Amino acid sequence: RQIVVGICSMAKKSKSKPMKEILERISLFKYITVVVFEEEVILNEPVENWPLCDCLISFHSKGFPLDKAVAYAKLRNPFVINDLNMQYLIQDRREVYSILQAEGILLPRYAILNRDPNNPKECNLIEGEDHVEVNGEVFQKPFVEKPVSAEDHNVYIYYPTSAGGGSQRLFRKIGSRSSVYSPESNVRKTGSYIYEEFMPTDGTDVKVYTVGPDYAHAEARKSPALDGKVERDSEGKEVRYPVILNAREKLIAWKVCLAFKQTVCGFDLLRANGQSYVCDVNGFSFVKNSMKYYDDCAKILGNIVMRELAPQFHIPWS
Ligand SMILES: O=P(O)(O)O[C@H]1[C@@H](OP(=O)(O)O)[C@H](OP(=O)(O)O)[C@@H](OP(=O)(O)C(F)(F)P(=O)(O)O)[C@H](OP(=O)(O)O)[C@H]1OP(=O)(O)O
Ligand SMILES: Nc1ncnc2c1ncn2[C@@H]1O[C@H](COP(=O)(O)OP(=O)(O)NP(=O)(O)O)[C@@H](O)[C@H]1O
Ligand SMILES: [Mg+2]
Ligand SMILES: [Mg+2]
Ligand SMILES: [Mg+2]
């Protein structure tokens, strides 16, 4: 028989152009059959009725029932490319940062402000006009305020008085805009946040995309922290700039991939002060609109599957 690679995600991801491009290429492997789980099945059918697979590629995004995916993996015991239990942790920036620190990965100096919602004024925050103190730790402006939920993209940057004060409010992009200036200079007073030092870059973010620990594609985009105007090409796509990772950065990618147990893993680097700092780990993400990436990513994933499962199946492989 064929080795079955099962794809288990929300339809917005399963049916995305990058996913379809990569699955068509994985299907070219002679002994691999791809099965994409229907969203109606994922949401509405018990996991005992989900299709069988030998290798499971499954990842959380908004609205995905991760509990069911975990239960499926437990029931069927496939080879899992992206660890499902770790995807609970990736949803919490506190957990992400904890893992990065444990791996000796450079990240912005940060502090966690946990607020009890039934008692929002009893947390360890002191605010001045040009700084905050969080659990005693001082962050001079500029500083960054991130919701503890990694799925909440309402990240705020607070500007110093010397720069005219106010804040930059980021959000999941809406057409031409990724952020907007606000005259508000005071921090949010409900919710839990990470406060972190603002890392001075050249105005670009480096977005890194792993396919296993020994392959990483990187590209740069304009930082939303800049003015918030999205640069789009003639085709409506956000403008990307070329990046080659240095030796330190390839090691970061190796570490992130393995630490989060996410074969396919997106994360963000800030090139600042002669170093590279990780500020976000997103988990499963494909590069968009690169044919070379689609070719490479499919080859690596197919090869991983064959290396793992060819012997069980009595299939020749090197
Ligand atoms: O799951 P991913 O494929 O990683 O997609 C994540 C990002 O990708 P990346 O984080 O930049 O690599 C998408 O932005 P790009 O397509 O990269 O611009 C997002 O694409 P969008 O910003 O919609 C778009 F396609 F770029 P536009 O329609 O503005 O051209 C995608 O956001 P949506 O939710 O709105 O689809 C996001 O997913 P999520 O919001 O679930 O985090
Ligand atoms: N400490 C920091 N110093 C400077 N810029 C920062 C810092 N943290 C975040 N940023 C900027 O703010 C952007 C958004 O922060 P990030 O932590 O990636 O948020 P997110 O909501 O997880 N976005 P996404 O990549 O879509 O999941 C980054 O891409 C940087 O441009
Ligand atoms: Mg095939
Ligand atoms: Mg995601
Ligand atoms: Mg969108």
Ligand SMILES: [Mg+2]
């Ligand atoms: Mg990010």
Ligand SMILES: [Mg+2]
């Ligand atoms: Mg993120």
